[PDB]
């Protein structure tokens, strides 16, 4: 709670691939949403595709799934892990995602209060 929601994404997505609970990319995300097995959806607003946001919003509106935004594309690679890390700690080859959907969480406490209570506020 001491950190805002912009840092909860760097710990809820960093502790979910360990337990393999994502549908990274658009087609995996669409499969997860149509499978009724989606809990969190993450979008980057930097996608210039017109039909991308429309269908993602429509699927996230027909189903009762929380919608999130990050406003940046490439950096999401570090939130998910599509980067080549160096020995010094330098991620060089970065490929960023546009629609990442969570299906399960891990075992941590720092992110269990920051963004997980940002849902009912919208009700």
């Amino acid at each position: 709670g001491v950190m805002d929601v912009n840092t909860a994404l760097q710990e809820v997505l960093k502790t979910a691939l360990i337990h393999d609970g994502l549908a990274r990319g658009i087609r995996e995300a669409a499969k997860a949403l149509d499978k009724r097995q989606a809990h969190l959806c993450v979008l980057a607003s930097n996608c210039d595709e017109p039909m991308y946001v429309k269908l993602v919003e429509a699927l996230c509106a027909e189903h009762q799934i929380n919608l999130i935004k990050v406003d940046d594309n490439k950096k999401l690679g570090e939130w998910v892990g599509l980067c080549k890390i160096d020995r010094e700690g330098k991620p060089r080859k970065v490929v960023g995602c546009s629609c990442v959907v969570v299906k399960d969480y891990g075992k941590e406490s720092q992110a269990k209060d920051v963004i997980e209570e940002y849902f009912k506020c919208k009700k």
Partner: protein, 72 residues
């Protein structure tokens, strides 16, 4: 024996190169400005991949890639 090098065949076989289709997710869902969606692809009634896997709209049959089920 002794090596005789006969490499002659009916030219050379070409390995099937797949076609790079961009954003194939688009054509499965039709989204209007009102929010409601329409499913343009008919779906397979199975258990291994039901609820999310669409079939093939060919000229005479519907076909699921994963199930290999064909409806004529």
């Amino acid at each position: 024996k002794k090596r005789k090098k006969k490499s002659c065949t009916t030219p050379k076989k070409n390995k099937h190169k797949r076609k790079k289709v961009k954003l194939a997710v688009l054509k499965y869902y039709k989204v209007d400005e009102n929010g409601k969606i329409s499913r343009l692809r008919r779906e397979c009634p199975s258990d291994e991949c039901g609820a999310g896997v669409f079939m093939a709209s060919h000229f005479d049959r519907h076909y699921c890639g994963k199930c290999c089920l064909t409806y004529c």
